[PDB]
Amino acid sequence: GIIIKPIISEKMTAVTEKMSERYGFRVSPNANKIEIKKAVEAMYNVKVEDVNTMRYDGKRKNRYTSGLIRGKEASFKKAIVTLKKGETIDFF
Amino acid sequence: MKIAEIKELATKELQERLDAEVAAYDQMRINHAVSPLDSPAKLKHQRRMIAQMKTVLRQRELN
RNA sequence: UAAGGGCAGACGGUGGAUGCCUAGGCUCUCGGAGGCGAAGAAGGACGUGAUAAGCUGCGAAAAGCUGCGGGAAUCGGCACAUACGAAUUGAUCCGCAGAUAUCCGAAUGGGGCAACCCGUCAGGCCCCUGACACAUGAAUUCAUGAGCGAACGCGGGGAACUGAAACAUCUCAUUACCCGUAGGAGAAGAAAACAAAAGUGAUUCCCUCAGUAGUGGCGAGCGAACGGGGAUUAGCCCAAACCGGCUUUGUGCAAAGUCGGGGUAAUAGGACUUAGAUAUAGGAGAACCUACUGGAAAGUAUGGCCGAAGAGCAUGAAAGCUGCGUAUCCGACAUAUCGAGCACCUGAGUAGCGC
RNA sequence: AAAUGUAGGUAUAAGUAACGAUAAAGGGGGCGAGAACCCCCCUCGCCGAAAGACCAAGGUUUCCUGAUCAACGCUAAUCGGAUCAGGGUUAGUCGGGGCCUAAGGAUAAGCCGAAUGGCGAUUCCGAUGGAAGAACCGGUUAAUAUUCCGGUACUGAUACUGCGAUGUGGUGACGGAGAAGUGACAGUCCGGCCGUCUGACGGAUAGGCGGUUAAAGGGUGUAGAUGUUCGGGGUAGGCAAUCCGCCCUCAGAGUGCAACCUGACAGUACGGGAUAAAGGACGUAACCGGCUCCCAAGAAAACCCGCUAAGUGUGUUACCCGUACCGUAAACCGACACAGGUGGUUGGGUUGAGUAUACUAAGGCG
Ligand SMILES: [K+]
Ligand SMILES: [K+]
Ligand SMILES: [K+]
Ligand SMILES: [K+]
Ligand SMILES: [Mg+2]
Ligand SMILES: [Mg+2]
Ligand SMILES: [Mg+2]
Ligand SMILES: [Mg+2]
Ligand SMILES: [Mg+2]
Ligand SMILES: [Mg+2]
Ligand SMILES: [Mg+2]
Ligand SMILES: [Mg+2]
Ligand SMILES: [Mg+2]
Ligand SMILES: [Mg+2]
Ligand SMILES: [Mg+2]
Ligand SMILES: [Mg+2]
Ligand SMILES: [Mg+2]
Ligand SMILES: [Mg+2]
Ligand SMILES: [Mg+2]
Ligand SMILES: [Mg+2]
Ligand SMILES: [Mg+2]
Ligand SMILES: [Mg+2]
Ligand SMILES: [Mg+2]
Ligand SMILES: [Mg+2]
Ligand SMILES: [Mg+2]
Ligand SMILES: [Mg+2]
Ligand SMILES: [Mg+2]
Ligand SMILES: [Mg+2]
Ligand SMILES: [Mg+2]
Ligand SMILES: [Mg+2]
Ligand SMILES: [Mg+2]
Ligand SMILES: [Mg+2]
Ligand SMILES: [Mg+2]
Ligand code: NA
Ligand code: NA
Ligand code: NA
Ligand code: NA
Numbered sequence: 001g002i003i004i005k006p007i008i009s010e011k012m013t014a015v016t017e018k019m020s021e022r023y024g025f026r027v028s029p030n031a032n033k034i035e036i037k038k039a040v041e042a043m044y045n046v047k048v049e050d051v052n053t054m055r056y057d058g059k060r061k062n063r064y065t066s067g068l069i070r071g072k073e074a075s076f077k078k079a080i081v082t083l084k085k086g087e088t089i090d091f092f
Numbered sequence: 093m094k095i096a097e098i099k100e101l102a103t104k105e106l107q108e109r110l111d112a113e114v115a116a117y118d119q120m121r122i123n124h125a126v127s128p129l130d131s132p133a134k135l136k137h138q139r140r141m142i143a144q145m146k147t148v149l150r151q152r153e154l155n
Numbered sequence: 156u157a158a159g160g161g162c163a164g165a166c167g168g169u170g171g172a173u174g175c176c177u178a179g180g181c182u183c184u185c186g187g188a189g190g191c192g193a194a195g196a197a198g199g200a201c202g203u204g205a206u207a208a209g210c211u212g213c214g215a216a217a218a219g220c221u222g223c224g225g226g227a228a229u230c231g232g233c234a235c236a237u238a239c240g241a242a243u244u245g246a247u248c249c250g251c252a253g254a255u256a257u258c259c260g261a262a263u264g265g266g267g268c269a270a271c272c273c274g275u276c277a278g279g280c281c282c283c284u285g286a287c288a289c290a291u292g293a294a295u296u297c298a299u300g301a302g303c304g305a306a307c308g309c310g311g312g313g314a315a316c317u318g319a320a321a322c323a324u325c326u327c328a329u330u331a332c333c334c335g336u337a338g339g340a341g342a343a344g345a346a347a348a349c350a351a352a353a354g355u356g357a358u359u360c361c362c363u364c365a366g367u368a369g370u371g372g373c374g375a376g377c378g379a380a381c382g383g384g385g386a387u388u389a390g391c392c393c394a395a396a397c398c399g400g401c402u403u404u405g406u407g408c409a410a411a412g413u414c415g416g417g418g419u420a421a422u423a424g425g426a427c428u429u430a431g432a433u434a435u436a437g438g439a440g441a442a443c444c445u446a447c448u449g450g451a452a453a454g455u456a457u458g459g460c461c462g463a464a465g466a467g468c469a470u471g472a473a474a475g476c477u478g479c480g481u482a483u484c485c486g487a488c489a490u491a492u493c494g495a496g497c498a499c500c501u502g503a504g505u506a507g508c509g510c
Numbered sequence: 511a512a513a514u515g516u517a518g519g520u521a522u523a524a525g526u527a528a529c530g531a532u533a534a535a536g537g538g539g540g541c542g543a544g545a546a547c548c549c550c551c552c553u554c555g556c557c558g559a560a561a562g563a564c565c566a567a568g569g570u571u572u573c574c575u576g577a578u579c580a581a582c583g584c585u586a587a588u589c590g591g592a593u594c595a596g597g598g599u600u601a602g603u604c605g606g607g608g609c610c611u612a613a614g615g616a617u618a619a620g621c622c623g624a625a626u627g628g629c630g631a632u633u634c635c636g637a638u639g640g641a642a643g644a645a646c647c648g649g650u651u652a653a654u655a656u657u658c659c660g661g662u663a664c665u666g667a668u669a670c671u672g673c674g675a676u677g678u679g680g681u682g683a684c685g686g687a688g689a690a691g692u693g694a695c696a697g698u699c700c701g702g703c704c705g706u707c708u709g710a711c712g713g714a715u716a717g718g719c720g721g722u723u724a725a726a727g728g729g730u731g732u733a734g735a736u737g738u739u740c741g742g743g744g745u746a747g748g749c750a751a752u753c754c755g756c757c758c759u760c761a762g763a764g765u766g767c768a769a770c771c772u773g774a775c776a777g778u779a780c781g782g783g784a785u786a787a788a789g790g791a792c793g794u795a796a797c798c799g800g801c802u803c804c805c806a807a808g809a810a811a812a813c814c815c816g817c818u819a820a821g822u823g824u825g826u827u828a829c830c831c832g833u834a835c836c837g838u839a840a841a842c843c844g845a846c847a848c849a850g851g852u853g854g855u856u857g858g859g860u861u862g863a864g865u866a867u868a869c870u871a872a873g874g875c876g
Contacts, residue, residue, distance in 0.1 A: 001215070003118065005125035009597065011651075015658090022658095024600095028215095032829060034283045043118065052600040052657080055831080059571070061208055071208040074201085080600055080658090091126050095221080096244095124205080132205035133240035136231085143216035147254055151221075154254080 002031050002039035004076065006091050021049075021083035029055060029077045036079050047084035054078045098144055103152055110145045117142065 007024040015022050027036055037048045058073030083089065101109060117138045123129060 001118065003122060005122060008126070011598075011653090014651085019659090032283070034281090034829065038281085038284090043115075054600050054654095054833085056599080057570090063208065069209060073208085074203095078600075128205075128238090131239060133231095133238090135205070137240080140216085140220075143220045143255085146216050147220050150216090150254060 002027050023089050024080045027077050027079050029075050040081050044089050046087050048081055049084050050082040052080040093141055099148055106149055113142050
C-alpha cells in the first residue's frame with residue numbers, strides 16, 4: 001500500500017504542463033525512494049528516472065469546548081516522480 | 093465473491109486470486125481519490141474479502 | 156412649577172436562588188475470586204471509515220476475519236445529515252473457541268534524547284526490501300527468573316511535632332515513612348508448657364478475668380497472666396544406637412561418605428543381648444371494558460377478570476390485566492470451575508557464664 | 511448579621527484614570543450599507559553598523575490564497591500574526607546523521623556496603639571540537655530552491671574494457687601578541703561604447719538617466735615566502751630497544767594574472783534584438799596554519815599512510831532526516847500585539863582617525 005493517491009493541484013498541473021514526464025503522489029510516510037520507484041513502476045508499468053520526496057506533518061485542528069480539545073491530521077509523504085523522457089501517465 | 097466460493101478454490105489458485113485482489117484494490121482506491129466511484133460500497137467489500145482469503149490460507153497451513 | 160429628587164404601585168430587564176427531577180455518588184450485606192507477564196504485561200505512540208476532528212473498537216487481515224451454539228428483521232459504534240450497500244440461501248446482535256495483532260515499554264542483538272538509529276548470522280528478491288535467530292543472571296542444549304499491580308502477612312531500618320501545663324529519663328511509637336519478599340490468606344502450632352498435692356494438656360481468634368497484679372523523674376503514663384465461657388478441632392515425619400551393600404581413604408582390618416533396613420521418647424522410649432452440578436448465551440410466562448374531565452388517562456365513577464404473578468421501570472398525568480417484566484417452570488455446540496537383663500543411643504562452639 | 515469568613519452575581523468611586531515611547535502627516539481615486547485608519551497614486555516625514563539582509567536557539571503553520579467581521583485587535587474597520595476551507599517545504603555534494611573522541615555518564619573483571627545501593631578499565635556512550643566523500647553562479651512560483659530548470663564542476667560504489675591487523679609505529683596535532691611588504695574583490699574618480707529623454711522660471715544640444723556583469727572548478731609556479739642542511743626510529747620485525755647498508759626538501763608552499771566568460775541585472779524596442787555594449791588611476795590580507803617576539807609553555811581519538819604476527823574508458827548507481835514562516839521580535843524568555851532580555855555573519859555613499867557623528871541609497875517603516 002505504498003501509493004495513497006495522486007496529487008491534482010494547481011502547482012502540480014502547471015509542473016506537468018511544462019515537464020510532461022513529471023507527476024506527484026502521496027505515499028506512506030515511512031517508504032524510501034527505492035521502494036517508491038518500484039511501486040510506481042509495478043503499477044503504471046513505466047520507466048521512473050528520478051524521485052524526490054518531502055515529509056509533511058499534519059495540520060493541527062484545535063477546537064474548543066471546556067477548552068483546547070487538540071486534533072491533528074495524519075502525516076504523509078510527497079513523492080515527485082520523473083519518468084523516462086517520452087513517457088506519460090493518465091489519471092483520467 | 094462470498095465465503096463459500098472462496099474455500100472452493102484450491103491452494104495454488106487461492107494465492108493467484110489473492111494477488112489479483114490486492115492489485116485491483118489499490119487501483120480502486122486510487123480511482124476513488126481521482127473521482128468518486130459509482131458504488132463506494134465496493135471498497136469495503138473488496139477490503140474485507142482480502143481478509144477472508146488471508147484467513148483461509150492461514151488455516152490450511154496452520155491446521 | 157420640577158432642571159432634578161423621594162415614596163408607593165403596575166409592568167418589564169438582569170441574574171440564577173428556590174421547588175420538582177436524575178444520568179452520578181456514599182456506606183454496607185451476602186457469594187465468588189485474589190492476579191497479568193519473555194508464547195512479551197501494565198501503560199503508551201502511530202495508524203485504521205464513502206465521508207472522519209475527538210472518543211470507542213480494532214491492528215497493514217486494522218468500527219474488523221473464520222467456525223459452533225442462540226435468536227429472527229432489521230443493519231453499516233457515540234452519531235447526526237448525504238451517499239452507497241448487507242440481509243428470511245437468516246445480515247446486524249449475544250455466548251464460546253480460533254485467525255490477525257505495527258512501534259515503544261521488563262525490552263532482552265548493540266546503542267539511544269521512550270515510540271528512533273546501527274549491526275552479525277543464516278535463507279529468498281533486487282542503491283534497497285522481506286522473513287529467522289543473536290541480553291543478562293542462577294540450575295542442569297534444555298529449564299527457570301526479571302517487570303507491573305489494591306489491601307491484608309512476614310522480615311530489615313526507623314522520626315519529630317506532641318504529653319509530662321518548662322525539660323533530658325519517660326511519652327508520641329516497636330507509629331509515620333523507606334526497603335525486601337509470600338499467599339489466598341500469612342504467621343503460629345503438637346510442651347525442655349501451665350499449675351500447686353487439685354488439676355489441664357498443640358496453635359489461632361472472641362467474651363471475661365481487669366484498668367486488676369505489677370511497672371513508672373512511683374511523675375505523665377503504661378499494663379498482663381492464671382482461671383472460667385465460647386468458635387474450631389488433628390495430628391505426624393526425621394537424626395542417633397545397630398545391620399547390609401557400594402565408593403573412597405589409611406593400613407583382611409578400620410575410618411569417612413552415600414542408599415537400603417531399624418527407630419521416634421517422659422508412665423521414658425529405642426538398640427543389642429467425584430461426575431453430576433454450577434458459571435458464562437436463551438425459551439415460555441395470566442388477566443379490562445363503558446362514562447366523565449382532559450392536549451394526552453394509567454385519574455375518577457360503574458361493571459368484570461388473573462393471581463405461586465398486587466416488585467419495578469417505561470408509555471402524552473398516578474396501570475395487577477398497554478410494553479419490557481415479575482411468580483413459576485424448562486434449557487448448552489464450547490469453554491471454566493467444583494521377656495528379663497543390659498548400660499549402647501536420644502540433635503555442641505550448643506546449654507550455661509563475664510562485658 | 512458580623513469570624514480583615516468562602517463561592518456566584520451585581521453595585522460605588524465614573525462615563526472618571528487610561529487607550530503603552532512627541533519618527534508625522536496631507537490630498538486624490540477605489541471597493542463598499544458603512545472609511546481618520548484598508549488598496550492604488552502624488553507629496554511629506556523616520557531608520558539606514560539598522561528600525562536593512564542571512565543563520566542558530568526557541569516557536570510550530572503564524573507562510574500563500576478564497577470566504578467571514580460574531581469573539582480577538584485597548585477606537586472603527588471593507589483590514590489582520592483573528593475564524594473556516596483549500597494550498598505550499600523537492601538534495602549523491604548544503605545542515606545533520608552514519609565515523610572519532612573531550613568534560614562527564616554507563617559499565618566489565620574486581621572492591622565496598624542493613625536494604626535501596628556506592629565505586630571501579632585502555633570498554634562503550636557522549637559535541638560545543640576532529641574527519642582522506644564531494645558544487646558554484648544565474649533564472650523561475652501566489653507561496654521552495656547550493657534542492658526545480660540552465661550552465662559549468664566534483665565524490666563514493668558497481669558492471670564490463672600476492673594481500674596485508676586485533677599488536678605496534680608515522681601522521682593528524684593545536685598558545686598569545688605585533689607589524690610590515692606584495693596586492694584582488696568592494697568602492698571612488700577619469701575616460702570610451704550601448705540605449706533612452708530634452709524636463710516650473712533665466713542658461714545649456716550640451717547635458718540628465720540606466721547600463722557596459724560574474725562564482726566554483728581548472729591552469730601558471732608570477733609578487734612574495736622558505737630552503738646549500740651514522741646513530742635514533744620506523745620499515746624489511748620480533749612480540750619498540752644494545753644494527754646495519756641506503757637514498758634524500760634542491761626543491762616545498764603561494765596571492766595576483768589567464769581561462770571558466772558568445773551567462774546575468776536595469777531601461778528601450780518587440781522566446782529573440784541593441785548587446786561579443788574599450789580601458790585606465792587609486793584603493794585593496796582576501797600571500798599568512800607564513801614571519802618576528804614573549805612566557806603563563808598552548809586537547810584526545812579516529813580518518814589516511816607503514817611493518818610484521820595471524821592468516822584509463824565508458825556506461826548504471828548514490829538510501830535516511832531537516833528545508834514553509836518569525837527570529838535586536840506582535841511569532842523566542844517576560845500572564846499582554848508589554849519602552850526589558852536574546853548567540854553568530856553582512857552591513858553601500860559623502861564626512862571623518864574610526865564600525866564615532868550628521869545627512870542619504872537599497873530595503874524597511876510613520
Ligand atoms: K533495543
Ligand atoms: K539414611
Ligand atoms: K479578503
Ligand atoms: K552581456
Ligand atoms: Mg535530482
Ligand atoms: Mg529531503
Ligand atoms: Mg421582577
Ligand atoms: Mg437548582
Ligand atoms: Mg449461525
Ligand atoms: Mg511539654
Ligand atoms: Mg504471587
Ligand atoms: Mg488459616
Ligand atoms: Mg480591607
Ligand atoms: Mg473624580
Ligand atoms: Mg479630569
Ligand atoms: Mg496604565
Ligand atoms: Mg486623560
Ligand atoms: Mg499607540
Ligand atoms: Mg534587523
Ligand atoms: Mg499573512
Ligand atoms: Mg472593534
Ligand atoms: Mg489568514
Ligand atoms: Mg555534508
Ligand atoms: Mg566511540
Ligand atoms: Mg520565502
Ligand atoms: Mg540558488
Ligand atoms: Mg576506538
Ligand atoms: Mg527559507
Ligand atoms: Mg501595539
Ligand atoms: Mg549580550
Ligand atoms: Mg563583522
Ligand atoms: Mg559608512
Ligand atoms: Mg551612528
Ligand atoms: Na416632579
Ligand atoms: Na500481514
Ligand atoms: Na421469553
Ligand atoms: Na586556482
